[PDB]
Amino acid sequence: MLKIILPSLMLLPLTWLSSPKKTWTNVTSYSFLISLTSLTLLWQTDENYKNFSNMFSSDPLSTPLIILTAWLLPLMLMASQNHLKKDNNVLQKLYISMLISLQILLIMTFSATELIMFYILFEATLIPTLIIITRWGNQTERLNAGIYFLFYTLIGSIPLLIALILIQNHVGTLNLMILSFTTHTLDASWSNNLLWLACMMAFLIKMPLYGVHLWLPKAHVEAPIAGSMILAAILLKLGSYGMIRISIILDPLTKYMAYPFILLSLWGMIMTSSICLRQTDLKSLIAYSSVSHMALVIASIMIQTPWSFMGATMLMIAHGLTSSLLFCLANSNYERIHSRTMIMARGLQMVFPLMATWWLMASLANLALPPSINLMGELFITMSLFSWSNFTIILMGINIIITGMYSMYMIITTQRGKLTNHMINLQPSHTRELTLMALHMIPLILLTTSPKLITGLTM
């Protein structure tokens, strides 16, 4: 794991020592090489998990998240290159440093084998996202968005810290593999119910429920493109990863203690898809779509079926890729027009043909299309939920119908129709942003071609 962490650590001296005319080139190229290096722990021949160190470990669950983070860092650099062109060199290098530190801390978080170290790196990732959102956001409400994001996360995470220290004082180790082996059943008391709530609510805040979710649209609207990318593609999945990790020591009482959150997830995915239907902001629409998909992930992890876990992992990776792609496309239009109003730019398929192709493919990934890991994850989540109770299929069907409706509504209202001819400042395309869309979409095709990698722990 150190062979991946240390080059990413040395990215920062490269960033601060590179010439100002070569900084973006050097950091982007070496971060691509670091992702290529991070591809090496897919070499999983045996069923044994790759335990490199006494503190670092690999997993069929942790590996796709690490590879996605290492892949997404150069994509964030490419996306954030254009909107920092009229900026001080020190500020540009500081922004690149924030992105690189996010990548380092997230790789360490996913590869950490101890829950307390996972918590430390969890809040360590909480810091530079706040700095990015507040310092480089565009509108006034970035400060409110940062406050909401930070303190939703912290009020979630403090009972998680209390619960982790309780578990460490009880069993003596707080190591994931020792807990997984000598896990102990809980005697179903009110203290154990509160312990379950304390160790769940941090991750239930971090990936959005129907309740606490109000920080996500604010942060996504007010964040720059790299911040939206890192949030919607890694941090919600970080909450899901934490839930999958910590659910193993709560064996007997999850089967009744998970009831309110399953209902909250299903009805909330319906309501957030409805908001996507009647939403006037493109980034808000993508954010609420992310809430709906993560609600599906919450329901699968709560019902704790092998099909549910596999579908949860597939939906995690697929949703990260397609949400980053949608955010990048919306950011390209926003860099053209300097407004996120959805109804204002309408006939963009006329002037941007292949960007419209990327829009069409991104929306076909957003809805569940059967040659895609999106439909793979959503379909196996549906199968596990219907096994859990047959009446969940009604909520699933309503969610799928509204999902198709808001995705095709997005395509029709922002690409098709008569072109708003008054918008003179529609530059043709940047090879950079077309490359950005291609680097989002081609991994979706490859993971569709071989979905055994995205299958998680259970099979």
């Binding site: 160190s53 006494n54 950490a112 101890e114 170290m117 707080l174």
Partner: protein, 57 residues
């Protein structure tokens, strides 16, 4: 035939001889309970380092 003592003669120690036995336990002292069993041995290093959470060393 008595001689009055000098200026500094009555104010010194005398070393009087007696046959009364010396009291072996003045103050009627109690058992004086034994101290703690001090641990002896070679100072080996701490096992597996500090054992503070995830710190290996």
């Amino acid at each position: 035939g008595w001689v009055r003592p000098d200026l500094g003669q009555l104010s010194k120690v005398t070393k009087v001889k007696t046959d009364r036995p010396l009291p072996e336990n003045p103050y009627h002292s109690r058992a004086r309970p034994e101290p703690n069993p001090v641990i002896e041995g070679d100072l080996k290093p701490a096992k597996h380092g500090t054992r503070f959470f995830f710190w290996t060393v």
